[PDB]
Amino acid sequence: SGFRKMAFPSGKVEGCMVQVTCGTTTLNGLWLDDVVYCPRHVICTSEDMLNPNYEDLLIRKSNHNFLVQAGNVQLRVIGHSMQNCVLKLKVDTANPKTPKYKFVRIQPGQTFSVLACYNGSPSGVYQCAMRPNFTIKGSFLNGSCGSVGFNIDYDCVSFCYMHHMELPTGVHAGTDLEGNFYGPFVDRQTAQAAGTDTTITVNVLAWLYAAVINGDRWFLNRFTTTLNDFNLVAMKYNYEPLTQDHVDILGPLSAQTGIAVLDMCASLKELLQNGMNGRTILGSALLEDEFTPFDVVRQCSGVTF
């Protein structure tokens, strides 16, 4: 029993964190095999940030202009290249702590663990989700650039996010490990704003199933709904549309609890209308959307209470 916002154990990722310095700028890098990956804005001065010409700035750099530090050991840079918004520094030593890994680009609604780092040193681990507006609600300060997001399903680490910037609303933007930004963002200090955010409906449904598995049913009702009537209602509460894909994905949780997806959809509709009336669901007074169907299956028991 219990249901917590659970992050993956960070040890496999901690062994890859390094500190990258280019002139006056210092940030974090990810050292896998003989390559160190970091945000390309490490080559920028504060006077460059508005409209940087990265190719022009990079062509003026040599290998020895990049200082890479792993613990208290200096790594020797023997090559450098740019792939989209990520800089790849070839080093003379393969990381002995390199775990089995993959680079994956995730979709909105997907969750991951973030290992927040400063000066190549991990300071904390937390779980978060890729918001529908392609931002993440992280906890990041100046110097956290280069911190990564990952999932560790089985023994392989799937890297899905590298931190690049904070937007004026306090939310964060970054790229996949191939340097492609999530969302309509750019690595420039120009005016950029996150689009209107929405609640991840399939994730709220998954979390309602997690509550049934753990013994709670106060929110269920005798009603059902069509998929379209649910979306007509939920979108009036800024909820993302629920697709047939989402309904199919919730199939196993539906079979485990005995509650059809569209019946859980009717329960959600009622919750949005009534609020909780002083009650909580899994220790929360809000509807939680940062647990996917896959997270619920991984954390909860296979036997309903």
Ligand X SMILES: COC1(CS(=O)(=O)N2C[C@@H](C(=O)Nc3cncc4ccccc34)c3cc(Cl)ccc3C2=O)CC1
Question: Known catalytic residues?
Answer: 41, 145
User: Whose Cβ is closer to ligand X: residue 82's or residue 167's?
Assistant: 167
Binders of Cl ion in range 49-108 (CB under 5 A): 106-107
Partner touching 286 among Cl ion, a copy of itself, ligand X, none, CB below 5 to 8 Å by kind: a copy of itself
Residue appearing with tokens 């036997």: 303
User: Whose Cβ is closer to Cl ion: residue 106's or residue 167's?
Assistant: 106
Amino acid identity of residue 126, one-letter, is Y
Instruction: Report if residue 272 touches a copy of itself, rule: CB under 8 A.
Output: no
Min CB(172)–a copy of itself separation in Å: 7
Instruction: Report if residue 245 touches Cl ion, rule: CB under 5 A.
Output: no
The CA distance from 191 to 193, in Å, is: 7
The CA distance from 177 to 243, in Å, is: 28
Min CB(6)–ligand X separation in Å: 14
The CA distance from 87 to 93, in Å, is: 17
Partner touching 41 among a copy of itself, Cl ion, ligand X, none, CB below 5 to 8 Å by kind: ligand X
Partner touching 21 among ligand X, a copy of itself, Cl ion, none, CB below 5 to 8 Å by kind: none
Min CB(105)–ligand X separation in Å: 19
H/E/C letters for each residue in 62-105?
CHHHEEEEECCEEECEEEEEEECCEEEEEECCCCCCCCCEEECC
- Chain centre to alpha carbon of residue 22: 27
Instruction: Report if residue 68 touches a copy of itself, rule: CB under 8 A.
Output: no
Nearest to residue 274, comparing CAs of 228, 223, 227, 226? Answer: 223
Nearest to residue 31, comparing CAs of 12, 46, 4, 57? Answer: 12
Sheet strands (E) in 119-230 = 121-129, 148-151, 157-166, 172-175
Min CB(177)–a copy of itself separation in Å: 19
Partner touching 258 among ligand X, Cl ion, a copy of itself, none, CB below 5 to 8 Å by kind: none
Give the three-state DSSP class for 14. helix
Binders of ligand X in range 113-152 (CB under 6 A): 140-142, 144-145
The DSSP annotation for 207-262 comes to: HHHHHHHTT--TT--S----HHHHHHHHGGGTBPPPPHHHHHHTHHHHHHHT--HH
**Contact code string over 184-223 relative to ligand X, x by CB under 6 A:** ---xxx----------------------------------
Asked if 115 and 208 count as a contact pair (C-beta separation under 8 A), the reply is: no
Instruction: Report if residue 185 touches a copy of itself, rule: CB under 8 A.
Output: no
The CA distance from 215 to 278, in Å, is: 18
User: Whose Cβ is closer to ligand X: residue 162's or residue 233's?
Assistant: 162
Chain contacts with a copy of itself (rule: CB under 8 A) = 1-12, 14-15, 115-119, 121-126, 128, 137-141, 143-144, 166, 170-172, 214-215, 280, 283-286, 298-305
Chain contacts with ligand X (rule: CB under 6 A) = 1, 41, 140-142, 144-145, 164-168, 187-189
